[PDB]
Amino acid sequence: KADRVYHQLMGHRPQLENLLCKVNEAAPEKPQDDSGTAGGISSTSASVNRYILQL
Amino acid sequence: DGYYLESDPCLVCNNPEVPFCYIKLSSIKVDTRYTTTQQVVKLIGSHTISKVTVKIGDLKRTKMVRTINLYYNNRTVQAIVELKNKPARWHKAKKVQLTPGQTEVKIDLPLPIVASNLMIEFADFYENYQASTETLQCPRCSASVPANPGVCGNCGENVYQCHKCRSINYDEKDPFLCNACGFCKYARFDFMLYAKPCCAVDPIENEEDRKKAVSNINTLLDKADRVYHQLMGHRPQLENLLCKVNEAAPEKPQDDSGTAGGISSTSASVNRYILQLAQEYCGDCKNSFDELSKIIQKVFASRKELLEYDLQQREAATKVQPTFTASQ
Amino acid sequence: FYFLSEYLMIQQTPFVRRQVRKLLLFICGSKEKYRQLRDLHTLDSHVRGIKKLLEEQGIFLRASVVTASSGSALQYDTLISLMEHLKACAEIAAQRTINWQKFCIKDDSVL
Amino acid sequence: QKLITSAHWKVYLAARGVLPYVGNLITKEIARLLALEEATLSTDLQQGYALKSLTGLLSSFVEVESIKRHFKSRLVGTVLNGYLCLRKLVVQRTKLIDETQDMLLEMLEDM
Ligand SMILES: [Zn+2]
Ligand SMILES: [Zn+2]
Ligand SMILES: [Zn+2]
Fold this sequence. Notes:
Subcellular location (chain B): Cytoplasm; Cytoplasm, Cytoskeleton; Nucleus
Largest sheet of chain A: none
Bound molecules: zinc ion
Protein name (chain B): E3 ubiquitin-protein ligase UBR4
Oligomer: part of a larger assembly
Shape of chain A: extended
Strand content of chain A: under 5%
Family (chain B): Belongs to the UBR4 family.
Radius of gyration of chain A: 15 Å
Number of helices of chain A: 3
Subunit structure (chain B): Component of the SIFI complex, composed of KCMF1, UBR4 and calmodulin (CALM1, CALM2 or CALM3). Interacts with E2 conjugating enzymes UBE2A and UBE2B. Interacts with RB1.
Distance between the termini of chain A: 26 Å
């Protein structure tokens, strides 16, 4: 069970790295409208970069 | 999206191309009065209107609309009753003719109108004449009632009362609209305005309005000064939040006893300085900047109207170029 | 041809126009030509209407140059009539383009 | 204003010629507003902060009797010109401009 959870944690590692790169770019991710049934994240909170949000 | 902390907001970045939209008239009415043929409405604010669509439901063949007149003005009034019986205060936008039994009317305006008030007039009818001589039936007790005076001899009910509000019209026994509540027994009318929420100021007539307009401009300028202070008042706090985030300190999420605020685990995870900055700028600075931009646009409209009035007066007092687009 | 086109232009004639239309296209001999003459007259009439409407308001066409003796802005109803005529011309030009092009090569000022 | 709160240093600066300098600055600012008055209708929230502050400085200097005595004849012209040019403002007239015009009126009446 431990090898499996370790792999899960190490499996999230790459995702963290990519999200960090996209944050490192410091690109202005102007809030994108929720075309699909995305969560009505409060505007005050939605403000935080979606890159930072996912991270 | 926008830079909310900007002095003398750009008339380009801030001012967008407001789009026209199929707004239900019912959603933007704040006051309504009626005559027997007119619906007179105050809007929640000034709107630029390009089209009006009229839908007609529950149509009765006994009396059908033949002519609709659309009127407007951009006068600021406290209550629409001030304009109800004042025909000289209305501008005619369009006259349209209907065929018998037509259930939809599209009124395309040749130029958009700026209006804070509308008047829709049912001006002519394809009335189908019937035998009104026949004794009417009492709506309460079904007894026969003579058409004159139209009062039931058994229960005292008036057969000409409005079915909706029970008001009686003294001058017209069979009005197209109830002058008290706008009820029409001949049809139901829905109005869809292809317009946009573009605020504007009332026209100026004489010094009464010119001095009044200048006072309004001064008040709005004082308001902008106040909202300016609020917007720039956040600037220092925003700079503080920026410095704090730049420190990039590992401040572990603090479990505040007060959990009334809807703080999600992810949000709690997000840096509080980051969260404080997001609330201060995207929330507070953006609200203050939106208020200031609205006030600035209204002030610009008042100045522009004042400028035009002054030019007209001088134009007459005096008694230009092909590239006149440069001017005005 | 001009008289028959003016009879068509008469809205007071909703049935007489139909008879005049048949006579006008008959005198023309070709529907294509008939439409060309009718469109040219309609555009010319709307153009002179705009010209005189701006003359009376104060926008004067002097040597194909617009002069505005009066400044400020134009009346809303003047813009309404202007838009009626210009929408008529736009309908003519978009529905039938060649007519408009030749009318404006005939009257350069218009352009 | 804190450094010159004493009439001692106000008189010293007046001797050096600060009053003509501030008068010329007020005149230049009012001329710039006039120049903008006939230009685009650019609304400014602080429009007139420099003008109001310069007029406040001039009023603070005038609030000393000796400087008033020695500079009434030299300041009357610039105060008259400034007040007259400020009265021309209609579209760009800001609350701060109104306060400046009131201060200039008070200074003129005092002069
Ligand atoms: Zn801008
Ligand atoms: Zn009865
Ligand atoms: Zn009623």
